[PDB]
Every structure is written in structure tokens, then in C-alpha cells.
């Protein structure tokens, strides 16, 4: 099956998921000189006060913090979006080295990691239906640079020892995802896809301009995770990012000047 290795990585995915060569694939490079300010874009509305985190899972590709999405508890609205999108999970993509790891790039710059807060459009009833729709998902992407620690990330960092290997999960209640946001909600937006198989073209991407900073010790602990299951050959979970894909017939819009 698919992965990030030399024999099963992004250059192989099209063989089982031909949409990998489609018209609206993600991530992309964000050319800040070609993205156009759109005054019709509204401020984003991030309403996470009632968020209910439940569990953290190592799925062999990343780790997902999962939320209760059976009511409007943690929702994203506004910006480019029509309607209400519920947070179902967040996860990250990161590098083996501080100079790489993000999926989106900004003027070809790679960040150390990238956080994806994944939301689905409530008009489609459930996440599985939503991924089949061109406006089914909204993923809020946030870049991570290495610098000062991010206090709101530490609870995530600290549980990773309990989910080192593929298939391990741990209770992860009462986590507040607002602690992962930067100060500014200025963003770029474009239509795209899931960045992992099945690569479905169902995502409105909203990528924040302002990165968050995490410490070297925090990102080092991401890199101690394992892609493999317990008892299999140890392979460090690093470089779990897809590189930028062709923008094709798409425009990236900026919420700011
Ligand atoms: N196209 S893909 O999903 O990346 C894919 C699927 C399977 C393999 N290899 S193998 O495990 O069957 C032996 C590689 C890539
Ligand atoms: N019940 S919950 O606690 O709120 C919950 C449940 C699962 C997750 N995991 S996930 O976010 O990675 C989404 C996993 N993908 C699907 O579930 N796909 C799907 C869904 C319906 C039909 C066909 C396919 C997170 C929270
Ligand atoms: N990197 S990204 O573009 O933000 C991105 C990439 C993928 C997803 N999909 S996901 O949430 O479901 C996590 C993957 N897990 C499954 O698909 N599980 C599953 C599968 C079949 C049936 C039931 C469950 C979301 C965001
Ligand atoms: Zn992702």
C-alpha cells in the first residue's frame, strides 16, 4: 500500500489513484506575487470553544487527534466557505530536517511542518459523504517553524510515546485546538484535494499566512514516531509530506493586502 518511501511514495500513487494527476491536486506552491487579494473574502470564523477531542491515533502515515463531530461543537465558517464545517480531526506533516516537512510552500519555501485541521460540510450529513463532493471539506493549514516552543502543542507531544507505532491509539480528551493557532487569521485559499490517497478533489484549502513556532524538542519528538507496527522493522515517521503539485487552472486568493 501507499506510503512515503522510495518504492511507495508520492511518485507511485497515481498507479492506484489516477486522480493524483488530476486538475485540482494539493498541496501547491503559494506564489505570494501571483495570489490576488479578494475583497469579497470574509474573515474566517473559527469557533472551537465547544470542541470535544476524543482520541489520538497513529495510523501509519501520521497521528490524528479525533473529535466528536456529531453536533456543531467546533466549526469553521466564513472566509471563502458557504455553510458550516465541523472539525473531525487534526494531524501534521513533518520533515526529517528542519528545512523541510510542509506540504504547501510559500514562494518555494518549505516549513518544518504543517498542521491540517480537517472539517466537513454539514450539508452532506457525514464525512464519508462529504469527501465525495467538490465542496465537502475545508482544511485549515498552518505552517510550523522551529523557534520558541508552542505551549498548546505540548500535550500532543507528551502522548506520542503511547502511540509510537501504527495502529496504536490513546484517550485524548479535553484538548483545546485553539492553542495551536497563530495570532493572525490572514489566509490564502484555493480549491484542491486530500494530500494523501485517495487524493479526492473535495477540499477548500485555507492556508494561514502566519506560521506558529514550535521548539526543536517538540518537532524532534514527532520524528521519534514510527510508520511501522509493533514488531515490524522500525522506520521513523519522518518526511510524511507530498510535494507541491501543478496549480493548473486555479487561482489562489488572499484575504489580505
Ligand atoms: N500506487 S501505490 O498505492 O503507491 C502502491 C501500492 C503498492 C505498492 N507495492 S506492494 O506493496 O504491493 C509490493 C507500491 C505502491
Ligand atoms: N465518530 S468520531 O469520533 O467523531 C470520529 C470518527 C473517525 C475519525 N477519524 S478521521 O477523522 O480520520 C475520518 C476517518 N475517515 C472516515 O471515517 N471515512 C468514512 C466515513 C463514513 C463512511 C465512509 C468513510 C475521527 C472522529
Ligand atoms: N492531508 S489532508 O489533505 O488534510 C487529509 C487527507 C486525508 C484525510 N482523510 S481522513 O480524515 O479520513 C484520515 C485518513 N483515514 C481514513 O481515510 N480512514 C478511513 C478510510 C476508509 C473508511 C473509513 C475510514 C483527511 C485530510
Ligand atoms: Zn494533511
Amino acid at each position: 500500500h501507499w506510503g512515503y518511501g522510495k518504492h511507495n511514495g508520492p511518485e507511485h500513487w497515481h498507479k492506484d489513484f489516477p486522480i493524483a494527476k488530476g486538475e485540482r491536486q494539493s498541496p501547491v506552491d503559494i506564489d505570494t506575487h501571483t495570489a490576488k487579494y479578494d475583497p469579497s473574502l470574509k474573515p474566517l470564523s473559527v469557533s472551537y470553544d465547544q470542541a470535544t477531542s476524543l482520541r489520538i491515533l497513529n495510523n501509519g502515515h501520521a497521528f490524528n487527534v479525533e473529535f466528536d463531530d456529531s453536533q456543531d461543537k467546533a466549526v469553521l465558517k466564513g472566509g471563502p466557505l458557504d455553510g458550516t464545517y465541523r472539525l473531525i480531526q487534526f494531524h501534521f506533516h513533518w520533515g526529517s530536517l528542519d528545512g523541510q516537512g510542509s506540504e504547501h510552500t510559500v514562494d518555494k519555501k518549505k516549513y518544518a511542518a504543517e498542521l491540517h485541521l480537517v472539517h466537513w460540510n454539514t450539508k452532506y450529513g457525514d464525512f464519508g459523504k462529504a469527501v465525495q463532493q467538490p465542496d465537502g471539506l475545508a482544511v485549515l493549514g498552518i505552517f510550523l517553524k522551529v523557534g520558541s516552543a508552542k505551549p498548546g502543542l505540548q500535550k500532543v507531544v507528551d502522548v506520542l510515546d503511547s502511540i509510537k507505532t501504527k495502529g496504536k491509539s490513546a484517550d485524548f480528551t479535553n484538548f483545546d485546538p485553539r492553542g495551536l493557532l497563530p495570532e493572525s487569521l490572514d489566509y490564502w485559499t484555493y480549491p484542491g484535494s486530500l494530500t494523501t490517497p485517495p487524493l479526492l478533489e473535495c477540499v477548500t484549502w485555507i492556508v494561514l499566512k502566519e506560521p506558529i513556532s514550535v521548539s526543536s524538542e517538540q518537532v524532534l519528538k514527532f520524528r521519534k514516531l514510527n510508520f511501522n507496527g509493533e514488531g515490524e522493522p522500525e522506520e521513523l515517521m519522518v518526511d510524511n509530506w507530498r510535494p507541491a503539485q501543478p496549480l493548473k487552472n486555479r487561482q489562489i486568493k488572499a484575504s489580505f493586502k
Side-chain angles (χ1 to χ4, degrees):
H1 271 57
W2 72 268
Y4 296 93
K6 296 156 275 295
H7 303 289
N8 65 352
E11 303 317 318
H12 290 281
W13 294 352
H14 72 93
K15 287 181 288 180
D16 286 282
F17 303 95
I19 203 176
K21 294 180 182 295
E23 298 302 317
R24 56 173 285 186
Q25 290 288 299
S26 295
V28 296
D29 179 59
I30 298 168
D31 185 323
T32 63
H33 298 108
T34 298
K36 186 185 172 66
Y37 170 62
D38 184 357
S40 64
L41 289 174
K42 313 186 176 119
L44 204 50
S45 172
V46 179
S47 295
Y48 295 166
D49 47 300
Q50 294 296 104
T52 297
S53 65
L54 294 173
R55 190 185 66 171
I56 189 169
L57 173 66
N58 179 336
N59 62 20
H61 305 294
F63 62 83
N64 295 340
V65 174
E66 296 169 350
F67 288 79
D68 180 7
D69 62 350
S70 67
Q71 287 177 291
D72 289 346
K73 287 181 174 179
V75 297
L76 180 65
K77 301 181 280 188
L81 301 172
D82 290 342
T84 299
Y85 290 67
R86 288 180 184 169
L87 178 65
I88 183 172
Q89 58 111 321
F90 67 81
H91 60 275
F92 304 79
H93 301 271
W94 61 92
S96 57
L97 297 170
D98 293 349
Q100 70 196 230
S102 66
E103 288 192 330
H104 294 86
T105 56
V106 178
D107 292 337
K108 300 294 179 66
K109 179 186 171 65
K110 294 182 173 78
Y111 287 89
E114 179 173 344
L115 166 61
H116 289 165
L117 290 147
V118 179
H119 307 78
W120 58 273
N121 188 334
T122 59
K123 69 186 177 184
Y124 298 127
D126 68 54
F127 179 82
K129 291 289 189 64
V131 299
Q132 314 179 46
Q133 311 307 322
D135 60 350
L137 275 28
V139 182
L140 180 62
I142 300 175
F143 298 115
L144 277 65
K145 64 182 180 180
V146 172
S148 176
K150 189 67 169 175
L153 179 62
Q154 190 56 43
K155 276 298 209 107
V156 174
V157 170
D158 280 330
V159 72
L160 297 181
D161 285 342
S162 65
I163 60 162
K164 183 178 179 181
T165 52
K166 176 179 53 195
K168 290 189 175 298
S169 64
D171 291 339
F172 197 76
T173 53
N174 301 116
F175 179 79
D176 188 347
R178 293 173 295 182
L180 297 176
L181 302 177
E183 294 181 355
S184 179
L185 297 178
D186 289 346
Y187 64 87
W188 296 280
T189 184
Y190 77 97
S193 69
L194 303 179
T195 66
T196 59
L199 298 168
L200 294 172
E201 289 178 342
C202 62
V203 179
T204 299
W205 278 94
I206 299 169
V207 178
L208 295 185
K209 169 184 70 183
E210 182 179 357
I212 62 169
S213 63
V214 303
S215 65
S216 46
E217 293 86 3
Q218 294 180 311
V219 68
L220 288 171
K221 291 180 177 179
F222 292 186
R223 295 174 186 153
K224 292 166 60 182
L225 290 169
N226 280 182
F227 290 123
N228 49 305
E230 187 180 7
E232 297 177 352
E234 186 182 11
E235 191 57 11
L236 295 177
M237 183 177 283
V238 296
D239 288 329
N240 60 348
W241 52 274
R242 190 190 191 185
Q245 301 300 311
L247 184 63
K248 293 180 176 178
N249 190 34
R250 292 177 292 179
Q251 291 185 302
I252 299 170
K253 299 303 184 182
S255 73
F256 62 100
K257 301 200 54 157

